[PDB]
Design an enzyme around this catalytic site. Structure first.
Site, PDB file in Angstrom:
ATOM      1  N   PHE A   1       2.272  10.975   1.589  1.00  0.00           N
ATOM      2  CA  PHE A   1       1.485  10.317   2.389  1.00  0.00           C
ATOM      3  C   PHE A   1       2.566   9.087   3.247  1.00  0.00           C
TER       4      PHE A   1
ATOM      5  N   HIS B   1      -0.459   5.562  15.880  1.00  0.00           N
ATOM      6  CA  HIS B   1       0.795   4.695  15.400  1.00  0.00           C
ATOM      7  C   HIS B   1       1.718   5.246  15.919  1.00  0.00           C
TER       8      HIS B   1
ATOM      9  N   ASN C   1      -1.675  -0.248  12.825  1.00  0.00           N
ATOM     10  CA  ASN C   1      -2.538  -1.605  13.008  1.00  0.00           C
ATOM     11  C   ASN C   1      -4.312  -1.478  12.527  1.00  0.00           C
TER      12      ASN C   1
ATOM     13  N   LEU D   1      -2.218  11.254  12.445  1.00  0.00           N
ATOM     14  CA  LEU D   1      -1.576  10.164  13.259  1.00  0.00           C
ATOM     15  C   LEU D   1      -0.753   9.846  14.137  1.00  0.00           C
TER      16      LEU D   1
ATOM     17  N   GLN E   1       3.908   1.521   2.701  1.00  0.00           N
ATOM     18  CA  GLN E   1       3.184   0.338   4.641  1.00  0.00           C
ATOM     19  C   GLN E   1       3.779  -0.427   3.868  1.00  0.00           C
TER      20      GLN E   1
ATOM     21  N   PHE F   1       4.949   1.382   7.963  1.00  0.00           N
ATOM     22  CA  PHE F   1       4.629   2.436   6.729  1.00  0.00           C
ATOM     23  C   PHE F   1       6.143   3.124   7.789  1.00  0.00           C
TER      24      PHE F   1
ATOM     25  N   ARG G   1       0.620  -1.039  -0.096  1.00  0.00           N
ATOM     26  CA  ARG G   1       0.181   0.626   0.248  1.00  0.00           C
ATOM     27  C   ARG G   1       0.823   1.299  -0.339  1.00  0.00           C
TER      28      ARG G   1
END
Lengths: 78, 229, 128
Positions: free
Chosen positions: B133, B190, B166, B186, B136, B177, B128
């Site tokens: 951004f 995270h 998660n 985030l 991952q 990531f 991903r």
């Protein structure tokens, strides 16, 4: 955790290969995979209720290992 | 006064010539000992020249007199006297190495780089990738999103930070990531646990394979990984 | 209860579809809106090429809908269908039983064995 949200699927998949698919990990007690009525086709995201929570947390750990139609499958708690 | 007559300089190289081409056939003692060349982190493409080392000095001098103005690849080349990692492959092409600085969260990621607990990241993918951004991975034997396992059981100020993927509070496994911008939304959701120290350019090559929906345009594989120890 | 449910007209068997009478009947209906294909081929499809239909059990009573509940045993952990193999695309373990190595045996089916791990596998079925 009893339920999971599952993204990124192809409509040839249905509620059955989800049934079969996630019970490979652990049994899906309640399956929900929307059928859209208007154009009669699936967007490909899912919700799964299990027996209890332990099933589903192991499911968080293992679960993101299903690839539907060569493509990636999202599984997260809910 | 010096004894550095082993490293030979090769110029006028082709776009296809690399440390390998020079090794099996360079100027002096190139393919032997060690070879140096201009390699990128994502592109990983040599320019045209390079430096080859010879086990001895005499062998090097003989390689120059010969390779000097030689004919390689239908061209005339010139010869004369001169913390963990992941190696990334994008499509069928090596992109380069990302080096990362990393207690329980750091130890998990360290062991997944070394495979010392019997499983880890080697050969797994970045499944991903979203431009501007994050990239991952860590779904080693999963290639989905939040798939994998920790060494313990089942369970953001700028670019180049390592953070745990998660599926809610207290669900860390192996998925992680690498940030591609400040991702402060985030924070508190995270667990950030490390940073890129070398190869931010290789992370940018991974990001280049991203799409808005996160689907990689080409496969991004952790070809090798381990620890500096 | 089956007011708005629109179903197909008729599902003919293979023994009638392999005789060519349906295409001849459709051509006759299109001409009206004869064939004389064969006389022994129909007897062969009725006697030699006869397919036994799927019957039901003595307690298998007809339900109300009886079409949206196509339940079938319980295809569990270690046993999957063909096509979903195709989507998975693995040549003859199913690869998330590689991660059933790391994260552990499933809470949901504790009795589990799957090939190569504690279960020392042929065809489809990779766990019991």
């Amino acid at each position: 955790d009893a339920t999971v949200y599952v993204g990124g699927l192809d409509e040839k998949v249905s509620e059955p290969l989800l049934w079969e698919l996630f019970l490979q990990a652990g049994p899906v007690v309640n399956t929900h995979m929307p059928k859209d009525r208007v154009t009669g086709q699936h967007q490909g995201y899912g919700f799964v209720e299990f027996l209890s929570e332990e099933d589903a947390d192991y499911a968080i750990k293992i679960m993101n290992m299903i690839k539907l139609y060569g493509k990636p499958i999202r599984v997260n708690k809910a | 006064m010096a004894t550095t007559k082993r490293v030979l300089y090769v110029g006028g190289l082709a776009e296809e010539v690399d440390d390998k081409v020079l090794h099996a056939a360079f100027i002096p003692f190139g393919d032997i000992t060690d070879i140096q060349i201009p390699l990128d982190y994502e592109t990983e493409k040599h320019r045209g020249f390079a430096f080859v080392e010879f086990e001895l000095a005499e062998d090097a001098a003989a390689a120059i007199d010969n390779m000097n103005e030689s004919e390689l690849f239908g061209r005339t080349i010139r010869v004369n006297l001169a913390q963990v990692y992941m190696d990334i492959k994008i499509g069928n092409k090596p992109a380069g190495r990302i080096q990362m600085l990393l207690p329980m969260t750091a130890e998990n990621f360290r062991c997944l780089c070394t495979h010392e607990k019997g499983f880890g990241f080697k050969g797994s993918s970045f499944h991903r990738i979203i431009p501007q951004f994050m990239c991952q991975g860590g779904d080693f034997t999963n290639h989905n999103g939040t798939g994998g396992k920790s060494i313990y059981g089942k369970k953001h100020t700028g670019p180049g930070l390592l953070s745990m993927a998660n599926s809610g509070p207290n669900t860390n496994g192996s998925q992680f990531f690498l940030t591609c911008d400040k991702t402060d939304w985030l924070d508190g959701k995270h667990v950030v646990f490390g940073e890129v120290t070398e190869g931010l350019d290789v992370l940018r090559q991974i990001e280049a394979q991203g799409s808005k929906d996160g689907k990689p345009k080409q496969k991004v594989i952790i070809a090798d990984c381990g620890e500096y120890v | 209860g089956k007011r708005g449910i629109e179903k197909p007209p008729f599902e003919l068997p293979d023994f009638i579809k392999r005789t060519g009478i349906q295409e001849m009947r459709e051509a006759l209906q299109e001409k009206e809106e004869k064939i004389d294909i064969d006389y022994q081929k129909l007897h062969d499809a009725f006697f030699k090429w006869q397919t036994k239909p799927k019957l039901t059990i003595h307690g298998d009573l007809y339900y109300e809908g009886k079409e949206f509940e196509t339940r079938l045993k319980e295809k569990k952990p270690g046993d999957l269908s063909d096509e979903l193999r195709i989507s998975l695309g693995m040549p003859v373990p199913p690869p998330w039983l590689i991660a059933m190595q790391r994260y552990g045996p499933p809470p949901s089916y504790p009795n589990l064995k799957i090939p190569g791990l504690n279960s020392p596998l042929y065809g489809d079925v990779f766990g019991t």
